[PDB]
């Protein structure tokens, strides 16, 4: 029961750590397209959504 | 225009006819509010809408509209899943919404393209009593139906966590190649009892892979109605686009009955079959046709449904539609529940009317339906012989009968008594079945056929 | 046009609709959606328009056809399914990758794309010709043709031009006919209103046998050719199972099977199950599905197809029997066609009648039993053709006092009812004899009688045995069986036999679940002449339970004789059952000693 | 016996820990993804304030939204709400808005453009109208702000699945 | 506002509404009687006027009161009798000189005599408050204090005035929150929609027992707090007794008292009896009169006062959920409550249902007993309240299967009969093992067992031998004594002195209406300690008649711990308990020799 009140934080601490990646990829591939999404986002705007 | 009048939770609009069947309509209160609605009705310049939110606080010419130009049409992803939703599809936990990847109907199926190819390969749940007596297969509906005052909920609970600690063994011998999810729909549960099911998912492993949603009754109708469909969706798109099969657990089909019949005192419905709408077949069976295999043939809904019995007789309306409709049905009986039978599954009418075009072989015998019939047939003679021993007395009854009481006896605390953490194959019980029913000579054993009995009584 | 004046859930009202009947065919919006005109008022009509009413923009144009729902018949209708508004539902696989239609769908109403292959008849030109005459006919049954070609009714003349044996499409004319100038030429096809009967020159006394091939249903009451039967179900009754009897064993030419709202599951085992069955007619290509045409619908699937899909499939059986064909009609389930008159009355604002279905369900149940029958074929060579209908019903009151059961058992003629506690016991097709009757019987018995069968005696004494079983029953539940003689245990002993033995007959392989008339016959005999011995025997002195005792391995040899196959012994009765009277009645002496 | 029956117990309170752990942490990997989804909507809404302050690229646009939106009206008359420099810009091209409504539809052009004396947030609006009819009781907030917003809905499904699927 | 356009009985029309929600509250003509909007169709709404038209005239103005239909919960709400729409009716005593109020005429919803001493919470100038934060809290009776001022829910903001301490009115002001711009002003007392339940940061699943004591009803089916509860009633056969005791022996934070719709002379029984009783935790001030605040509507009064009367208690409570109480709502009875919506359904001219009760029913009943549990409050803080609700009900329509009953059966989780035999008895509650259930056992025991007691193991042996006690007694009439010996003689004695000391009580001691947790295990372990070493005794070779005149004096004296002391070894632990383990053991060697 030990290690299930103070060995279930370090699953937390795996948790954390790996979604460091994720939320750099994210960033990464979200910053390069983020122009060309704009562009089809302001043609379908001012025109009928 | 403005909102002309207001009739329960349906609101009379003034409008103009042009929006299209389905599509939102948003009214502007000067409360700050903005409530969703969706057409019922469209009309001559008027239409008729039920709200998502409320059903009150709607004032007259103070109120305004203005539309969306979108049908209602369900944002669907298999990003919702691992997460806990209310019954219009929103977290409950506040944070990132379900959004889409697809929109997909609820007023009517999408693609429609349910089964050409009979559900036959089984499914397992880890429990003798519905598998054997009762043959469930991947497209299949088998309902359970149990009478008030019953844990229909705790019967559903060890469905659940047993079904995918069998499906590796299972995986062995032919019956799932393909990720399994599960999806929960609550109408009018309790919220100590939702607890209980998102805690039986933790169990399993398939907390991760399941979508809940919980609709009270003290939140308005017209999200409870939703609720359902909202599953059904959800459900065929994993099924659909990654192949899976996902069981579909729908609590309670009576609760979803009552929401329908307020909707109709508040129409110009009359209520048909005992003060329930005479459309009640349109909407069961809105239900029931997505159900069955899906294109590609590895995907598939598998159903599920639980109905208590709300004045707990099988001649009431509600249970003898949904009976139809349905392949089948589980019988749970009170007067086990009581005696600390557990699970309570009385077998005196449980029957599944796939049961020799559920198996095959490779995985079952074919002699599992056979087993079925003996087992079924000497259960319901054994209970008219306990009948008979409960007025006349032992002395008086006859040799045949003093057999079959004995039959039942054995059946209720081995067969339908097992664990609620215990597992069990296909195979393994039907041993159990051969030694039960093996109280009884060849003559009197008839049910099947001297072949398969010469080897095994 | 039409202008849609309101879509209010699957009603929909438009305005300034001109030449509109009361069930005239329409086609709503830019979508074209399957409708139907139900009522007028005023200038406005309301149509219900029954195929997803969902994202229907309101102010599009109506579209008349200019006559009612209809069917297609000719050529490409066996061993492909359709549904209950007759478009085609495996066309439909090919092109939107779906099995059933969502909505948009706009297909021709048969395939007419294939071609199909044309013989003249012993018609020439300068020959006269009627309707209903057979001008050709296309090969398409499992050993004969099956879609005979028609002149169509009321139309008679003299062929201008007859085309000769070659293969056409549906589409192409191979036909002019000239009265009075030029009728219209025609096609391999026509069309034709399903709101109205295809004619025939007379209807006939239905007098001959309709095998079911279930042994207890045959029995207790046999079916004839133009019967009518009523059967209520309540779920898991092995209605399937029935169905798929009547599909094989049956002496029609045709089965027609429908589905009239069905759970979709179930109408995909039925189909893939019968190219694999092989005809008893020594059947190819498909041997069984060869003689089958599907009507199959799903729940939700557009109340129009439901409404509808009782009439269109007996207007296809009216067709083949205008050929002389014998078909049989299996609906499946009317129940549910009951249901979709419940919600029609509703919707409209219509009031309905007792028990808030309406009893303009009556009639129109009526007249869809009149358009079968027995008949003699339309058109001048005379054959004799059928039409038998056999229709499911359920409660819907969990009683057979509901208004349902109780109006399609007036008007029929064969009624076999359901047992939920028998059904308990493993027994399915489950009657009684309390429960059942057909008029018909007397004549069919005579018939039997012939072929080789004691049927007429045997009938008697099966309905007075099971009877008399149900009166001294209640005494012992009640009371005790150590109040009442031995005699009438006796009784119940000699009908439990029969209760195992005929009523489940549900069959795990064929043999099981099928039983031709001969075979039916000697299972009924053997039993009958054990109660006659039995009485007997005990009556001298012996006992009752050393009777049971010595008979013993005899009951389970008669038990076991449905698992065997009947093509064993001289014919059809098995040398089991011939060997088993003479060890009844080498049994008795030793009961009696 | 029983020692199984808690151990078990337990076994599923360490399994029951593992599951709101990783459940957590999917929904760190959706919202980070959500907070780079509506920072391309940051970028969509100042190149809006930027074309709205244009009087001469921003008329063909300010155009179509009012005749698009009289469309989603079909009155005969109708009410135009805007901003207080769009007004200018509404004044300077009535009779062409007029022209394309009667030209898009069976209808015979619009009677009358009043140009409203209300005015919306110059703060939190930038461009566009509220188009209304007569009496003002439909109106359709057919403003840059609301198509973008309206877009996102619908928008959403295509951008999740191009970049992250 | 609006002009009355019709008068039709009861149901009042008014036209000219141009903005009025389907909710709101109205005062109508110059009677100014009560009504509400239950649908409104165009500029003419439909309102129920729920008291009497008789001298309301067509074309009188009908004004908005502006807010809907909502009550008032403040401090002073203890030791007050209202009805569900909240009017004092001790004021009306005064005043009218009538406990029932006179139409046309309302009177402030919370006293305006009362002045109540408020003292600041933690919040300060300028500090930052969120929704559920405790603001300050003020006294609601002089002995303690209760209500404590949270800031209301959909408000949040800094607050630019913070009133210091002191005694202020009702009436007057303290507070005003700035966020928008001065949001509104705000008071001692808030409002909150009646059928709007307050709300929570979230719910808990209830494992905390009720405070009763009632010793039955703690070990054999564990009384819950935060549950469900349905109890059978006739009316005055024991059930309304039973909510009688239920508010005596209890001793919770609040106890909120709904008559729905009672006979009158149980109102009154109520109201005189309470301040006259004492609270079992030893508290004063007229005792249990001051821990209860009551909605007492008796049938005869206005059918708004009795809907709005489970509504009103319902947010009360809830709102205590909020404070961090503890709250027992007892509600007498849902089957009148049923009732007064099937007459507003028929006077409306709107369709009722199922059984002549409206569509609306299961919604409604459904939506009340969810809305009941245990919860932690909304706001940083987090105190922990629970809502138990127990509901009475009565056969209605005289049948106790129609849908009103067997709806809440399936809901509940809590069951404990009534029985007419057992209640002249003097067993209250009136139940067996078989009349009633807890399905919240589960959990329960599980939380008895951690705070000391060996609870789990024997609460089910306590089930176990009242069952077989009634089994064995079947056994002696049809089989005979022959059957019988004096292992099952001594299982009939257990459950003799169980049914003695659990089931029957009345409150004959102070000492017999509360028993602590750890005195309710005590007197289970001496019945199942006799039961085990009886047993072994007589097959060591002993008789029943002399185990049971050997046991004797040990027997008697755990009979008797009702009346004993539970302070006797401390405060909750009873000592005779602990010393009877080793006169058990000297007492089996008396026994067995």
């Known amino acids: 029961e030990q290690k299930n009140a103070g060995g279930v934080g370090e699953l937390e601490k795996k948790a954390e750590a790996g979604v460091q990646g994720e939320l750099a990829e994210i960033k990464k591939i979200a910053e390069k397209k983020k122009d060309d999404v704009v562009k089809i986002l302001i043609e379908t705007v001012i025109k009928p959504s | 225009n403005t909102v002309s009048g207001v009739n329960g939770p349906l609101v009379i609009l003034e409008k103009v006819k042009f929006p299209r069947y389905n599509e939102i309509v948003n009214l502007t209160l000067p409360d700050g509010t903005v409530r969703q609605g969706q057409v019922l009705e469209i009309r001559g310049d008027r239409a008729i809408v039920q709200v998502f939110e409320g059903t009150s606080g709607i004032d007259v010419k103070k109120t305004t509209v203005e539309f969306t130009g979108e049908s209602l049409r369900i944002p669907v992803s298999e990003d919702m899943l691992g997460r806990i939703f209310d019954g219009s599809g929103r977290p409950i936990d506040n944070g990132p919404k379900v959004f889409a990847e697809d929109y997909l109907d609820i007023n009517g199926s999408p693609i429609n393209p349910y089964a050409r190819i009979y559900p036959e390969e089984m499914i397992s749940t880890g429990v003798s009593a519905i598998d054997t007596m009762n043959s469930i297969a991947r497209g299949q509906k088998i309902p359970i139906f149990s009478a008030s005052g019953l844990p229909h909920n705790e019967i559903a609970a060890q469905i659940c966590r047993q079904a995918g600690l069998v499906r590796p063994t299972k995986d062995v011998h032919d019956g799932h190649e393909e990720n399994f999810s599960i999806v929960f729909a609550a109408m009018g549960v309790n919220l100590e009892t939702a607890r209980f099911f998102k805690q039986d998912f933790e169990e399993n492993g398939s907390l991760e892979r399941t979508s809940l949603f919980l609709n009270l009754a003290n939140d308005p109708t017209i999200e409870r109605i939703i609720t359902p469909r909202l599953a059904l969706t959800t459900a065929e798109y994993l099924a659909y686009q990654t192949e899976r099969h996902v069981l579909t657990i729908l609590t309670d089909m009576s609760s979803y009955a009552d929401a329908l019949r307020e909707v109709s005192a508040a129409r110009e419905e009359v209520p048909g079959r005992r003060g329930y709408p005479g459309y009640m077949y349109t909407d069961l069976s809105t239900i029931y046709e997505r159900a069955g295999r899906v294109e590609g043939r590895n995907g598939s809904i598998t159903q599920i449904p639980i109905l208590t019995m709300p004045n707990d007789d099988i001649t009431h309306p509600i249970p003898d539609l949904t009976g139809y409709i349905t392949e089948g049905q589980i019988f749970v009986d009170r007067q086990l529940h009581n005696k600390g039978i557990y699970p309570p599954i009385n077998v005196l009418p449980s029957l599944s009317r796939l049961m020799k075009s559920a198996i095959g072989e490779g995985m079952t015998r074919k002699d599992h339906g056979d087993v079925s019939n003996q087992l079924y047939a000497k259960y319901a003679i054994g209970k008219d012989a306990a009948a008979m021993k409960a007025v006349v007395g032992e002395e008086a009854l006859s040799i045949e009968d003093k057999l079959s009481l004995e039959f039942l006896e054995k059946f209720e605390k081995t067969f339908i008594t097992q664990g609620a953490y215990e597992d069990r194959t296909v195979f393994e019980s039907l041993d159990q079945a051969w030694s039960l029913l093996r109280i009884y000579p060849k003559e009197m054993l008839n049910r099947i056929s001297p072949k398969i009995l010469d080897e095994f009584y | ?593 | 016996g029983n020692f199984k029956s808690k151990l078990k117990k337990a076994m599923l309170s360490q399994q029951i820990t593992k599951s709101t752990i990783a459940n957590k942490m999917r929904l760190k990997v959706l919202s980070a993804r959500e907070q780079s989804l509506d920072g391309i909507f940051e970028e969509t809404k100042e190149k809006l304030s930027g074309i709205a302050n244009n009087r001469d690229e921003y008329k063909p646009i300010l155009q179509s939204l009012i005749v698009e939106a009289l469309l989603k009206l079909l009155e005969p008359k109708a009410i135009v709400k805007a901003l207080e420099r769009d007004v200018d810009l509404i004044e300077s091209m009535k009779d062409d808005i007029m022209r394309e409504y009667g030209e898009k539809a069976q209808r015979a052009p619009l009677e009358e453009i009043v140009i409203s004396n209300d005015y919306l947030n110059k703060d939190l609006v930038s461009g566009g109208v509220v188009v209304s009819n007569a009496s003002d009781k439909i109106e359709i907030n057919n403003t840059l702000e609301e198509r973008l917003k309206l877009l996102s809905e619908e928008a959403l499904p295509a951008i999740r699945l191009e970049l992250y699927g």
């Open chain 3, 1 to 593: 046009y039409g202008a849609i004046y309101s879509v209010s859930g699957p009603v929909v009202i438009a305005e300034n609709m001109i030449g509109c009947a009361m069930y005239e065919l329409v086609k709503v919006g830019h979508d074209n959606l399957v409708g139907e005109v139900i009522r007028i008022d005023g200038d406005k009509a309301t149509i219900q328009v029954y195929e997803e009413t969902a994202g229907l923009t309101v102010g599009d144009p109506v579209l008349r056809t200019g006559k009612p729902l209809s069917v297609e018949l000719g050529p490409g209708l066996m061993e492909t399914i359709y549904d209950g508004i007759q478009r085609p539902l495996k066309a439909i696989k090919e092109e939107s990758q779906s099995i059933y239609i969502p909505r948009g769908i706009d297909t021709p109403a048969l395939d007419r794309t294939i071609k199909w292959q044309f013989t003249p008849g012993k018609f020439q030109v300068g020959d006269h010709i009627s309707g209903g005459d057979i001008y050709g006919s296309v090969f398409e049954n499992s050993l004969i043709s099956s879609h005979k070609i028609l002149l169509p009714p009321r139309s008679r003349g003299t062929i201008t031009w007859i085309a000769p044996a070659g293969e056409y499409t549906l589409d192409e004319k191979i036909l002019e006919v000239e009265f009075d100038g030029k009728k219209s030429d025609f096609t391999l096809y026509h069309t034709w209103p399903v709101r109205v009967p295809r004619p025939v020159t007379e209807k006939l006394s239905a007098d001959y046998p309709l095998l079911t091939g279930q042994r207890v249903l045959d029995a207790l009451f046999p079916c004839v050719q133009g019967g009518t039967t009523c059967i209520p179900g309540a779920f898991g009754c092995g209605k399937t199972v029935i169905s798929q009897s009547l599909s094989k064993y049956s002496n029609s030419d045709a089965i027609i099977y429908v589905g009239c709202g069905e759970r979709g599951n179930e109408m995909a085992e039925v189909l893939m199950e019968f190219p694999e069955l092989y005809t008893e007619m020594s059947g190819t290509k498909e041997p069984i599905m060869k003689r089958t045409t599907l009507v199959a619908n799903t729940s939700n699937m557009p109340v129009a197809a439901r409404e509808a899909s009782i009439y269109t499939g007996i207007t296809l059986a009216e067709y083949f029997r205008d050929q002389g064909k014998n078909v049989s009609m299996i609906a499946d389930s009317s129940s549910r066609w009951a249901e979709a008159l419940r919600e029609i009355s509703g919707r409209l604002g219509e009031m309905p009648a007792d028990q808030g279905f309406p009893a303009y369900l009556g009639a129109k149940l009526a007249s869809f039993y009149e358009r079968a029958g027995k008949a003699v074929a339309l058109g001048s060579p005379d054959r004799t053709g059928s039409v038998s209908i056999v229709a499911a019903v359920s409660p819907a009151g969990g009683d057979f006092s509901d208004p349902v059961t109780t109006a399609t058992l007036g008007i029929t003629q064969v009624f076999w009812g359901l047992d939920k506690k028998l059904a308990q016991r493993k027994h399915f097709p489950s009657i009684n004899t309390s429960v059942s009757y057909s008029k018909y019987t007397n004549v069919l018995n005579k018939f039997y009688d012939s072929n080789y069968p004691e049927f007429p005696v045997l009938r008697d004494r099966m309905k007075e045995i099971l009877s008399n079983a149900e009166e001294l029953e209640q005494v012992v539940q009640l009371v005790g069986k150590s109040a009442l003689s031995d005699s009438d245990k006796i009784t119940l002993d000699v009908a439990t036999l029969i209760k195992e033995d005929f009523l489940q007959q549900n069959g795990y392989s064929t043999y099981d679940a099928f039983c031709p008339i001969w075979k039916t016959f000697d299972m009924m005999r053997a039993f009958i002449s054990y109660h006659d011995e039995a009485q007997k025997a005990v009556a001298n002195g012996a006992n009752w339970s050393k009777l049971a005792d010595s008979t013993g391995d005899v009951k389970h040899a008669v038990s076991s004789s449905k698992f065997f196959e009947p093509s064993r012994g001289e014919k059809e009765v098995h040398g089991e059952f011939e060997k088993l009277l003479s060890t009844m009645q080498e049994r008795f002496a030793e009961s009696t000693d």
